[PDB]
DNA sequence: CGCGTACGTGCGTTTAAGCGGTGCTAGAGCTGTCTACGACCAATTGAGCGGCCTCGGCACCGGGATTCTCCAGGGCATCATAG
């Protein structure tokens, strides 16, 4: 579960935040040959060293290609960052982040990399 | 083969052409003279002609540059699809 080197705007200067089970770094994949879907989605929380100053990285596209990405900055509070992260994970998977352990692949939603 | 417009057809309106006359006069046409211009003619001579050279512009030949034609693609943007 390494920080993406492809995030040039953020590589080098920060360390991804995790907590045991709850790892706020993850890559999800969805393949579906019926509809020719083959897409991935990485999410990464990064902390500043000086202050409690966090950033949420999202990156998604067809497998292999960087496609598109978004940076939502959360210098305000890390809890906001958890909100964005967990809410988006639910939106995208229909699984809660606290209950991420018992993942059940519903059709047309992301699964993660074991 | 399709499409669109402009000319033919037909019909009604206007106006000067045609017609017929009258009248006027410019100039066409005729006639008579006479002169100057061209025919004519003979002699003269030089301008022009045939002949004869002759040199430089042109024909030819070759060779290379440029242009014209031509085709193959360098490369690169439209489009479908992703996420």
Curated annotation (Swiss-Prot):
Variant or mutagenesis effect after changing residue 110 to F: Reduced recruitment to DNA damage sites. Decreased poly [ADP-ribose] polymerase activity
Tissues expressing this chain: Widely expressed, mainly in actively dividing tissues. The highest levels are in the brain, heart, pancreas, skeletal muscle and testis; also detected in kidney, liver, lung, placenta, ovary and spleen; levels are low in leukocytes, colon, small intestine, prostate and thymus.
Any coiled-coil regions, as ranges: none
Record note on what altering residue 110 to A does: Reduced DNA-induced ADP-ribosyltransferase activity
Annotated effect of mutating residue 38 to A: Reduced recruitment to DNA damage sites. Abolished DNA-induced ADP-ribosyltransferase activity
Cellular compartment(s): Nucleus; Chromosome
Residue numbers of the full-length protein present here: 92 to 205 of 583
Recorded family membership: Belongs to the ARTD/PARP family.
Subunit structure: Component of a base excision repair (BER) complex, containing at least XRCC1, PARP1, POLB and LRIG3. Homo- and heterodimer with PARP1. Interacts (via the PARP catalytic domain) with HPF1. Interacts with core nucleosomes.
Impact when changing residue 41 to F: Decreased poly [ADP-ribose] polymerase activity
Effect recorded for residue 63 to A: Abolished formation of a complex with core nucleosome and HPF1, leading to abolished ability to catalyze serine ADP-ribosylation of histones
Entry remark concerning the domains of this protein: The N-terminal region (NTR) recognizes and binds poly-ADP-ribose chains produced by PARP1, leading to its recruitment to DNA damage sites. The N-terminal disordered region does not act as a key DNA-binding domain. The WGR and PARP catalytic domains function together to recruit PARP2 to sites of DNA breaks. The N-terminal disordered region is only required for activation on specific types of DNA damage.
Name recorded for this polypeptide: Poly [ADP-ribose] polymerase 2
Limits of the WGR domain: 13-110
Function noted in UniProt: Poly-ADP-ribosyltransferase that mediates poly-ADP-ribosylation of proteins and plays a key role in DNA repair. Mediates glutamate, aspartate or serine ADP-ribosylation of proteins: the ADP-D-ribosyl group of NAD(+) is transferred to the acceptor carboxyl group of target residues and further ADP-ribosyl groups are transferred to the 2'-position of the terminal adenosine moiety, building up a polymer with an average chain length of 20-30 units. Serine ADP-ribosylation of proteins constitutes the primary form of ADP-ribosylation of proteins in response to DNA damage.
Record PTM: Auto poly-ADP-ribosylated on serine residues, leading to dissociation of the PARP2-HPF1 complex from chromatin. Poly-ADP-ribosylated by PARP1. Acetylation reduces DNA binding and enzymatic activity.
